[PDB]
Every structure is written in C-alpha cells, then in structure tokens.
Write a protein that binds this DNA or RNA. Structure first.
Ligand SMILES: [Mg+2]
Ligand SMILES: [Mg+2]
Ligand SMILES: [Mg+2]
Ligand SMILES: [Mg+2]
Ligand SMILES: [Mg+2]
Ligand SMILES: [Mg+2]
Ligand SMILES: [Mg+2]
Ligand SMILES: [Mg+2]
Ligand SMILES: [Mg+2]
Ligand SMILES: [Mg+2]
Ligand SMILES: [Mg+2]
Ligand SMILES: [Mg+2]
Ligand SMILES: [Mg+2]
Ligand SMILES: [Mg+2]
Ligand SMILES: [Mg+2]
Ligand SMILES: [Mg+2]
Ligand SMILES: [Mg+2]
Ligand SMILES: [Mg+2]
Ligand SMILES: [Mg+2]
Ligand SMILES: [Mg+2]
Ligand SMILES: [Mg+2]
Ligand SMILES: [Mg+2]
Ligand SMILES: [Mg+2]
Ligand SMILES: [Mg+2]
Ligand SMILES: [Mg+2]
Ligand SMILES: [Mg+2]
Ligand SMILES: [Mg+2]
Ligand SMILES: [Mg+2]
Ligand SMILES: [Mg+2]
Ligand SMILES: [Mg+2]
Ligand SMILES: [Mg+2]
Ligand SMILES: [Mg+2]
Ligand SMILES: [Mg+2]
Ligand SMILES: [Mg+2]
Ligand SMILES: [Mg+2]
Ligand SMILES: [Mg+2]
Ligand SMILES: [Mg+2]
Ligand SMILES: [Mg+2]
Ligand SMILES: [Mg+2]
Ligand SMILES: [Mg+2]
Ligand SMILES: [Mg+2]
Ligand SMILES: [Mg+2]
Ligand SMILES: [Mg+2]
Ligand SMILES: [Mg+2]
Ligand SMILES: [Mg+2]
Ligand SMILES: [Mg+2]
Ligand SMILES: [Mg+2]
Ligand SMILES: [Mg+2]
Ligand SMILES: [Mg+2]
Ligand SMILES: [Mg+2]
Ligand SMILES: [Mg+2]
Ligand SMILES: [Mg+2]
Ligand SMILES: [Mg+2]
Ligand SMILES: [Mg+2]
Ligand SMILES: [Mg+2]
Ligand SMILES: [Mg+2]
Ligand SMILES: [Mg+2]
Ligand SMILES: [Mg+2]
Ligand SMILES: [Mg+2]
Ligand SMILES: [Mg+2]
Ligand SMILES: [Mg+2]
Ligand SMILES: [Mg+2]
Ligand SMILES: [Mg+2]
Ligand SMILES: [Mg+2]
Ligand SMILES: [Mg+2]
Ligand SMILES: [Mg+2]
Ligand SMILES: [Mg+2]
Ligand SMILES: [Mg+2]
Ligand SMILES: [Mg+2]
Ligand SMILES: [Mg+2]
Ligand SMILES: [Mg+2]
Ligand SMILES: [Mg+2]
Ligand SMILES: [Mg+2]
Ligand SMILES: [Mg+2]
Ligand SMILES: [Mg+2]
Ligand SMILES: [Mg+2]
Ligand SMILES: [Mg+2]
Ligand SMILES: [Mg+2]
Ligand SMILES: [Mg+2]
Ligand SMILES: [Mg+2]
Ligand SMILES: [Mg+2]
Ligand SMILES: [Mg+2]
Lengths: 236, 275
RNA sequence: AUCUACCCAUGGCCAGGGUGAAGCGCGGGUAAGACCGCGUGGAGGCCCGAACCCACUUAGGUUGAAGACUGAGGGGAUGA
RNA sequence: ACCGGGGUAAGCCUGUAGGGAGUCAGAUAGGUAAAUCCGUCUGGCAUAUAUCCUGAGAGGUGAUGCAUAGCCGAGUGAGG
RNA sequence: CAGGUAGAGAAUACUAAGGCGUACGAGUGAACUAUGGUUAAGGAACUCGGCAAAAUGCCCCCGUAACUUCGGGAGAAGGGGGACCCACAUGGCGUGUAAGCCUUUACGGCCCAAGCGUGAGUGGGUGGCACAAACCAGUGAGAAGCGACUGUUUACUAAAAACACAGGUCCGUGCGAAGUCGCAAGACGAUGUAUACGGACUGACGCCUGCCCGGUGCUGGAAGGUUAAGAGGACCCGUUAACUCCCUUUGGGGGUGAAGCGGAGAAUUUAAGCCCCAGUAAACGGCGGUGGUCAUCCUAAGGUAGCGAAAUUCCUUGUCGGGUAAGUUCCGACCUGCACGAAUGGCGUAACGACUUCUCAACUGUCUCAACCAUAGACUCGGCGAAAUUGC
C-alpha cells in the first residue's frame, strides 16, 4: 500500500485536496496496516502426498519434512537428511522452493501472515520413474509444510518500535500516565534540554499510528518524537 | 370495521375494504342456497331495460326468511354470522330448537350464541320478531311488513333502522329511513334492532375494475353524445333555469310519483330535502 | 348478430425472471403505546419479457402475394 | 479408442408419503304422511400416531409371453 | 404432444426423430429501384421535426439526486470485474449406496466411506486487438403544457388533450317503487328496499372565502314566557389624541376613523302549565353591532364583489437579464388606477404517457459528399402469356 504522512489534520486535508485537484487523484482514505510476521510455537513433522495426472506430464511426488520453532530473527533454514537418495537431487530445489512459497503464503488460514524463523528438515520421500516433476515435488513439499504446521501452534509477532518521546519536564508526568494506559514501558526520561525531556520507550507499532497527533495536541506543539522498529513481540 | 390498503399501487391508493370482523364461517349452508344467474339488465324481450349492468362475479342466492310467522314460541340460537353477496348486510344463521335452520338479516350487536325468540310473547331484545301491536312505542325496528302477511320489505339495508313513532286504532305510525312518516297496519310484523354493517358506506372501492367486479358497467355522460342520441345540448341548465338534466328519453326533472294512488291515504307526510 | 357491438351459460390459456403489501413471530421503545429493526408471508387493474391480443413510427406494396398486407422496430401481457 | 443396445401396459395383489374424520345411548315433528335416516337438545366415554376412509408412488404379478441391438441365408418375394 | 447443447426461458443459435428443397428456368460485374453490409476527416452543419439509422443492452460487486401522496422516483445517474490452466480442494454444498447405530421390526428412523452432481471465492500463470467475443440483449439526464393513474376509441387516412374511471354534488323513488321494453298481460330494476335503485353534471389527492336564531317559513321534539348552585372558557369590566354632529347627566357613541393591551368571568348541560323557544340560512332570509371563530341578541326573497382570499392572466402600452456566434419553447424580476376571473371553479401536485413543445450528453451516411460489395428485379435467351387505354 501507498502511505501518505502529514503533520496533522488540516495539512492532510490540504494535501489530499491538492492531489485530487492538481492531478485528479480519486482516492478514498483507508486504514493503515502495520507489517506483521508469523512464527512457530512448537515442533512437528509433516507429510505431503501429491497426485495430479493431467494431459501433459503426469505429476506425482511425496515428501516428508520436519519443522522446529526457532528464535525470532533466525530466518529460514533447511537441513536435508534423505538416506539412499530416495528423492532425486535435482528435485530438492523444487521441494525447497515449494516450501519457501508455501511459508510465504502463510499457515494461519487463507490470511496466513509470512511465517518466519523456521527450519525445514527433510528426511524421507518416495519417487516414481516418470511421475516425478518440479511442480509435483513443489506441492509435495508445500503439503508437507501444511501437515507439519497442523500439529502445533503458530505464534504471531508484532514489531515493537523504539520511541523517543520529547516532552516538557512538567509534561513528563502526563506521558507516564498515558503511556501506562498504552501498555508502554519507560526505559528512562532523559532531559532533552532545559524544558523538554527525552523519554526512552519501545511501543508496539499498532500504538504508534496516531502517537504524533495526540502528542502534539497534549503538548500544544511541544511534542517531538522518533520511531524505529526494534524487534517483534507476541500478542499480549 | 374498515381496513385501509397501503398505497402500493395507483389502484389502491385511497382504497379500503370491509374488515370482515363479524363473519364467523366462510361457507353457506348447502340446503339454503339456490342458483342465480346474471341478466345484464335485459328483460324478457332481450332488450336493455336497465343500463350499466352486466358482467360481475358469479353469486349464489341464500334463502332469507322475510316471513317469520311459521315459528312462534320456538326459540332459536344463532349458529354463525356470515357473508352474503346479494345484499348490503350480513346474514345470521338460526338453529331452531325445533330443529330447522333458517337465515335472517344480522342486526346490530348480535353475537354468536344468543337466543332469538318470536311470537307475541317475545322480549324486546334485538333480533326478536314481533307483531307491531306488541312492540312498545319508541323502539327501533327493521324488516317491517307492509301488508299483514306479505313479508318484510322495509329497512333492510345495512345500518338502517326505523323509529316506531306511535299507535292509534288499527294503524301504527312509523318513520321511514328516508325520513317520512307512514302508517301501517298494526297487524304487521317487525324485527327489533338496527341492521349490521353500519360502516358499509365508508368503503372506498379505489379502482374501476373493483366496481366492475360488482356487475356495474361504465356510464357515458349525455353531453358527449350526439343530438340523435341524447336530448342534452339543448336547454342548457347550469345556472339559468331548471332544465339542468334531461333524461335520455327526453323527460325533464320533477315529481315522478304517480298522483292519485291508494297508498297516498297512508302517507302522513313525504320526506323532505334541501336543508 | 356464422363478420362486428354488447350480454348470458359452460370450458380453456397465460414460457421465464424480479420487487416484496397486509398478516404472523422475535428484538428495541414505553407504565401501556405510537413506531423502529430482523425473520416468515407472497399482495398488486405491480415491473422486464415469449406465446396470445393489439396497431404508434417508418420503408415496401399501391392493374399488390393480399378488395387493408409484408419487413423492421412498438403497446398490454394475473387482468376493466 | 469409437459405435449401437442397456426394453415391456391396463388389470390384479399390498396400502407407504400426504390429506380427512370423535364415539355410544336417550329424547324430539322440524324435514307436505312415516321414519331407526337427516337436523336439534341432553347426557356417558374419549385425546389415543388407537381406528376407519382416501391415497401419488415403491415392490410383486401380468411376463416360460411380447418386443429389441444385432446375426444368417433368399429373391416375385417368401423364411429364420 | 414438447428430444440434445448453450441459455433464466416454450426467447435465440445450431441440431436429433421426422419433414421438406413448393411446381417457370438458364445467364449476365448497365443505369435505376428494393433489402442487406462497410466507410477516411467532421458529427445534426440535414430537416417542419435527429424521420431513418447508429448507439445502450447481460451477470456479479460498489454506489445512487431534486422532489414525494413516504409506496416511490430507481435498473436513477456513475464506477469496477467477466476467457483458459493450475493450487487451495481427497475442501464446501446436494444426493446417498456399503459399513454402523436405534426402534413400537417395517414399504421403519439416524449417521453415512465410496459413487454421481455442483457453485462461489482467494492466489499464481497463460493467450489475443478484442474474454456479457457469435446470436440474444434498457439510450440516459433536464424543463414546459394537457390528462391524476391501469384502460377504451373512428374494422379500412385521426389512439389523442377525446370516452371511461375511482372520488364528489344535485334531483327523483316508501315498493308488482321511480325509470325502461310492450296496445296490453308481462318482464328488467331485484329474488334488491333509501348505507337501495335510477337520472344529470363533475372527474385521484391537497389548499386559501366571511357576518348569524327576532318576525316569518320548514323540521324534529321540551332543549322551553319563570328558572337552584356547580359543570360549561371569547369577550365586557380598570385604562382614550385630532375632530363634524349627538345623548345622557358626576362622561361615551356615529361619521374620515390609527394601533394597542390583560384577568374577576358570558349559555346548550341537570327539576313544575294551554302558547313557545330551539335545530337549520346569504336553499324564506339576511348584510349590522358585538367578542371571535354555532356562544345575550338584534335583519323576508340579492349568488349578489362575497371581501379589498398578492400562486394571479393576453398584462412589451416599458426596464431588463438567462439560454445561442446568431433564440424558438421557456426561465426569472420590476409597470399597465380602468382590462381581467376563479372559490367551488380556480391556482398546486409525487407517480404514470407509442401525448404536444424544448435543451444537453453519447451516437451515427441525416448532412458536408458521396464510393464500393451481394442479393431480388430490371437486362439477354427458351416456354406460357395478360391490362388499363384506343375517332384517326
Ligand atoms: Mg323472444
Ligand atoms: Mg346508472
Ligand atoms: Mg353482502
Ligand atoms: Mg361510496
Ligand atoms: Mg384510488
Ligand atoms: Mg363518466
Ligand atoms: Mg363527439
Ligand atoms: Mg363534441
Ligand atoms: Mg342509431
Ligand atoms: Mg332530439
Ligand atoms: Mg339538450
Ligand atoms: Mg357551472
Ligand atoms: Mg355544467
Ligand atoms: Mg336571474
Ligand atoms: Mg326562475
Ligand atoms: Mg422476504
Ligand atoms: Mg412484514
Ligand atoms: Mg402488469
Ligand atoms: Mg408498462
Ligand atoms: Mg381495436
Ligand atoms: Mg409500383
Ligand atoms: Mg410479388
Ligand atoms: Mg406495418
Ligand atoms: Mg410487427
Ligand atoms: Mg412486443
Ligand atoms: Mg410487458
Ligand atoms: Mg456407450
Ligand atoms: Mg341423528
Ligand atoms: Mg407397478
Ligand atoms: Mg429446447
Ligand atoms: Mg424458435
Ligand atoms: Mg434428417
Ligand atoms: Mg435466376
Ligand atoms: Mg446485364
Ligand atoms: Mg446489379
Ligand atoms: Mg445501401
Ligand atoms: Mg464516416
Ligand atoms: Mg472514422
Ligand atoms: Mg446538438
Ligand atoms: Mg438548412
Ligand atoms: Mg438546423
Ligand atoms: Mg423551424
Ligand atoms: Mg428513430
Ligand atoms: Mg438499430
Ligand atoms: Mg439503485
Ligand atoms: Mg444502472
Ligand atoms: Mg430519474
Ligand atoms: Mg446393535
Ligand atoms: Mg433409534
Ligand atoms: Mg446406509
Ligand atoms: Mg497482450
Ligand atoms: Mg434492455
Ligand atoms: Mg424493447
Ligand atoms: Mg404554468
Ligand atoms: Mg403557448
Ligand atoms: Mg390519460
Ligand atoms: Mg385532472
Ligand atoms: Mg394507456
Ligand atoms: Mg382509423
Ligand atoms: Mg397511442
Ligand atoms: Mg392510427
Ligand atoms: Mg373516444
Ligand atoms: Mg361517479
Ligand atoms: Mg357515483
Ligand atoms: Mg312504474
Ligand atoms: Mg336522496
Ligand atoms: Mg345533472
Ligand atoms: Mg378530483
Ligand atoms: Mg370534463
Ligand atoms: Mg380539468
Ligand atoms: Mg339571492
Ligand atoms: Mg396577460
Ligand atoms: Mg427575446
Ligand atoms: Mg415566460
Ligand atoms: Mg361557480
Ligand atoms: Mg395548472
Ligand atoms: Mg403535471
Ligand atoms: Mg400517449
Ligand atoms: Mg464528387
Ligand atoms: Mg437478376
Ligand atoms: Mg421471353
Ligand atoms: Mg382490352
């Protein structure tokens, strides 16, 4: 999505009017969606069986992989331990890429968020003389991923961003009171200058869409703040 | 009561229908029904003698007892009150303790289950039939005879009643629903009470077809006709004289009751018009 | 009155698709109500449109295929 | 792979889905006479998936038959 | 009677069973005529007039104005998607056999792997100029007039603003009624009974017209010449410049007559006698106070300006604007004492219209300005073979 950032409300109205007038941009305001990711909460194994006998090249492939939960930031990993070359080496990339696409499409329903920090561990599979194919093995790995994900929980993570809150020293109490109701934690209140105070805090991204406007309204223009994604936290 | 249609269609904008509240049964007694075919307004010659009549829904005749003399001292109870296409009022069905079923006009306020008794000794409750000499002066009656034994002829339509003004010698002086005073022999019979469906006159039929279902055909005005067809055009009317209407057969306005009539000796006074 | 106008008795016909009246039930409102939403329901000289019935425009015909038609469009089509 | 077959009534059995229906006794002149029939009034026993009536269709029989996809040979055309 | 595939369909396209090639032909790029098709650039400039053509057309999502009788207007308008392959998907839904469960065991009930059928959606990919690819299949918006609406109408030049209509008003009819058909008997009205029937005019619905019970009428019935307190809810009372004439006595009433302003409270409803009041009005009236808006009460023939009900109508006897380059319909505002009429015959009106008039968008051979293609004729050959007309 394309996101327009404005200082406040009147300037936002002015810029949207200019866009719809100087350039004829007919648009409607919509909710801004924050980035989100998915992670595994437990370890499980999967079984993927594929049979598709179409009019071109007959496709049939079976794969058996293993997935384990990994710490946030680990990224995607793959370990292969097939014994005796049961599945062809040329099709290992096919299965791999099928699993990568399947985990990209998500595992939590049709709205599965990008699964991250997961290791796929292939061990077993069956092969056919003619029915083996790139696409076949791709889906076989995909379905193995579905079966593995179906056995344990999937945890959602939201990106917490470091927020540097600069408010006058007399208004630090207000920020402490309101951020307390904002599920926020305060890592310090460093005096920015003689009047304002830099506040060290990290807050979930969902809470930071409207932070600037309320900060400026409460500070009567004395509110300046910075945001920077730090890490990911599960749903409270 | 009257149920008003919602204006979902130009044919039903201001229309209304009779809320058939008093009706108990939706079918007639099989033995009291007689066949009946429309005529279109044509007499035995085949010519149109009454215009604007024809078509209309098929209907069957219910045998109504206008001659309640056979059963005196035999009480009856009303079985149902039901619909009758042939007349404006509803018809009540009487089960006689004797064991005979009969039909009468349903009077006002008559409910299912009441007891109807006739003769000289009957009470003055609504629905009871009495010879006129036994009816105290001042009550409201309906379905009155003209000659002693000829059957009821007067005050039959819905919401219609007459006031028994008094008695003298052999004759009782009555007031017609039209408002005139008429004398009738006190040996005639009459039923106590008004006639039901007092809200009949408030029905708004709403569309031309609804009146066509009732067997009435459209009327063409006389002015839009040719002089060979209707004597209007000549004489005007309007606000000049009194020849405002002329009948299609050339007759002007005026009194149409035949002068020098026997019954004229019985008429205490004629009705009055014109505020 | 085997054409046509009107009426009378007795039969028949009206593909397909929409909209969604009263009534009934639940919920809200209220002391009770007006009324308001959600379901059932399937009204109506209701809507779109074949058969069927008409005849608004236009072209042709005009010693015609026809002494009133044809081709394209057109109106009504559960109702007087 | 393709082509062609992949049939058979009324009637007679059975009585399903659906629909409908209280039963017994007494009295009674109202039904041109008379009625055990029909009405009307009294009671008694009944709410039963009890019973009866009606009733599409399924199933059996009709049918060891009839018809049929096809296969054979003849020559007017007969025959299987 | 009603096959199959698409389709919502008995539409349309193709086709099965079945039935036809139907009765003058054979040729030939003439003009011209008819019916089809296409057209550069422009797009109503054509014309009395967008006549005729062209255009829109389906399904699914989204989104819908003035006004209103609250039903509509509305499919308003406007915007986006539509093909094929694959995956989700051994999914979902429908049906239901095997297996299983249950019961008053039977033409029983529940669930139901398999089998068959079938959408809708999301994601990715492929192809074309084009995916509702053919056939089929709304043009839309605004303003004025008339008629409320659906209908009916001059078979064969007029479908409308004409007729009808639902609603309204008046008149007649007390009952083998009035009316009608018949010389009559008889019949319809009606197996009806004044909330009914017949005749006349008007024609949905909505909105603005005012003053009041003495005499005389009419009418029903004691409301009443005498009237119990209380129920019954506008005024009088407390409060007056200018005047031209007045009537009374410790200030108010007419004419030219200006505005004003509150609270004690005026009778139908509740009881006694012949006569009566009361109900009704410009239908027997009636035009004057009082207050409003039938309340004490005062005035017989005149629907008659009633009233002076600012939506007023040729009202360019002008001053203007709006629309077009050039303005018709029409739209607005101001003058014209006299015109000029509708208060029950006149202004309004949503919805509806093969109605009349006008504007805009889209679209096009209507036009600038015509060209080309095919059929059916014309034309050539063979066969059959007319007609109107006709002093020569
Ligand atoms: Mg005869
Ligand atoms: Mg009439
Ligand atoms: Mg009736
Ligand atoms: Mg009426
Ligand atoms: Mg109406
Ligand atoms: Mg008329
Ligand atoms: Mg005429
Ligand atoms: Mg005329
Ligand atoms: Mg004639
Ligand atoms: Mg004459
Ligand atoms: Mg005349
Ligand atoms: Mg007049
Ligand atoms: Mg007139
Ligand atoms: Mg005069
Ligand atoms: Mg006169
Ligand atoms: Mg519904
Ligand atoms: Mg409802
Ligand atoms: Mg219709
Ligand atoms: Mg229509
Ligand atoms: Mg016709
Ligand atoms: Mg010619
Ligand atoms: Mg010809
Ligand atoms: Mg034609
Ligand atoms: Mg046609
Ligand atoms: Mg049509
Ligand atoms: Mg139609
Ligand atoms: Mg086969
Ligand atoms: Mg019996
Ligand atoms: Mg059988
Ligand atoms: Mg078909
Ligand atoms: Mg067809
Ligand atoms: Mg064939
Ligand atoms: Mg030829
Ligand atoms: Mg030639
Ligand atoms: Mg040619
Ligand atoms: Mg052409
Ligand atoms: Mg062109
Ligand atoms: Mg072009
Ligand atoms: Mg134009
Ligand atoms: Mg010109
Ligand atoms: Mg022009
Ligand atoms: Mg012109
Ligand atoms: Mg046209
Ligand atoms: Mg066209
Ligand atoms: Mg809409
Ligand atoms: Mg639309
Ligand atoms: Mg519109
Ligand atoms: Mg068991
Ligand atoms: Mg069981
Ligand atoms: Mg089973
Ligand atoms: Mg492309
Ligand atoms: Mg259309
Ligand atoms: Mg059409
Ligand atoms: Mg006007
Ligand atoms: Mg004009
Ligand atoms: Mg009309
Ligand atoms: Mg009108
Ligand atoms: Mg019409
Ligand atoms: Mg004509
Ligand atoms: Mg027309
Ligand atoms: Mg015509
Ligand atoms: Mg006409
Ligand atoms: Mg009328
Ligand atoms: Mg009338
Ligand atoms: Mg007579
Ligand atoms: Mg009258
Ligand atoms: Mg008249
Ligand atoms: Mg009207
Ligand atoms: Mg008229
Ligand atoms: Mg008019
Ligand atoms: Mg007068
Ligand atoms: Mg004028
Ligand atoms: Mg001008
Ligand atoms: Mg004008
Ligand atoms: Mg008048
Ligand atoms: Mg007007
Ligand atoms: Mg209008
Ligand atoms: Mg029209
Ligand atoms: Mg040229
Ligand atoms: Mg030719
Ligand atoms: Mg020749
Ligand atoms: Mg000759």
């Amino acid at each position: 999505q394309i996101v327009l950032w404005c200082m406040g409300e009147a300037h936002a109205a002015v810029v949207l009017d200019a866009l719809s007038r100087r350039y004829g941009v007919s648009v409607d305001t919509v909710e801004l969606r924050v980035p989100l990711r998915e992670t595994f909460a437990g370890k499980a194994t999967g079984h993927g069986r594929h049979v598709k006998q179409s009019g071109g090249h007959g496709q049939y492939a079976v794969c058996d992989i293993e997935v384990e939960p990994l710490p946030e930031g680990s990224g995607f990993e793959f370990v292969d331990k097939v014994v005796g070359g049961a599945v062809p080496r040329q099709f290992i990339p096919s299965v791999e890429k099928g699993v990568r696409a399947q985990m990209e499409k998500g595992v939590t329903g049709e709205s599965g968020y990008p699964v991250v920090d997961i290791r796929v561990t292939l061990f077993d599979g069956k092969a056919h003389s003619v029915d083996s194919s790139d696409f076949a093995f791709q889906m076989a790995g995909a379905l193995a991923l579905r079966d593995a994900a179906a056995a344990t929980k999937i945890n959602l993570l939201e990106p917490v961003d470091d927020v540097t809150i600069v408010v006058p020293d007399d208004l630090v109490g207000t920020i402490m009171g309101d951020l307390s109701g904002r599920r926020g934690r305060v890592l310090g209140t460093d005096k920015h200058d003689a009047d304002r105070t830099v506040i060290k805090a990290e807050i979930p991204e969902v809470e930071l869409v409207r932070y600037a406007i309320d900060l400026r309204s409460m500070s009567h223009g004395a509110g300046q703040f910075r945001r920077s994604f730090a890490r990911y936290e599960p749903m409270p | 009561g009257i149920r008003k249609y919602k204006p979902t269609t130009p044919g039903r904008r201001g229309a209304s229908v009779s809320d058939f509240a008093e009706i108990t049964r939706s079918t007639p007694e099989k033995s009291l029904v007689r066949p009946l075919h429309g005529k279109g307004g044509r007499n035995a010659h085949g010519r149109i003698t009454t215009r604007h009549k024809g078509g209309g829904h098929k209907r069957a005749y219910r045998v109504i007892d206008f001659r309640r003399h056979d059963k005196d001292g035999v009480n009856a109870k009303v079985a149902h009150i039901e619909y009758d296409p042939n007349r404006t009022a509803n018809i009540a069905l009487l089960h006689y303790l004797d064991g005979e079923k009969r039909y009468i006009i349903a009077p006002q306020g008559l409910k299912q289950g009441d007891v109807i008794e006739s003769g000289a000794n009957a009470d003055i409750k609504p629905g009871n039939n009495l010879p006129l000499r036994n009816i105290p002066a001042g009550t409201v009656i309906h379905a009155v005879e003209l000659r002693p034994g000829g059957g009821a002829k007067l005050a039959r339509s819905a919401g219609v009643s007459i006031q028994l003004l008094g008695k003298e010698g052999t004759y009782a002086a009555l007031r017609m629903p039209s408002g005139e005073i008429r004398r009738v022999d006190v040996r005639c019979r009459a039923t106590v009470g008004e006639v039901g469906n007092a809200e009949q006159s408030n029905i708004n039929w709403g569309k031309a077809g609804r009146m066509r279902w009732k067997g009435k055909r459209p009327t063409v005005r006389g002015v839009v006709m040719n002089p060979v067809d209707h004597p209007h055009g000549g004489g005007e009317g309007k606000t000049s004289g009194g020849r405002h209407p002329v009948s299609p057969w050339g007759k002007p306005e005026g009194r149409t009751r035949k002068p020098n009539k026997p019954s004229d000796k019985l008429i205490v006074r004629r009705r009055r018009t014109g505020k």
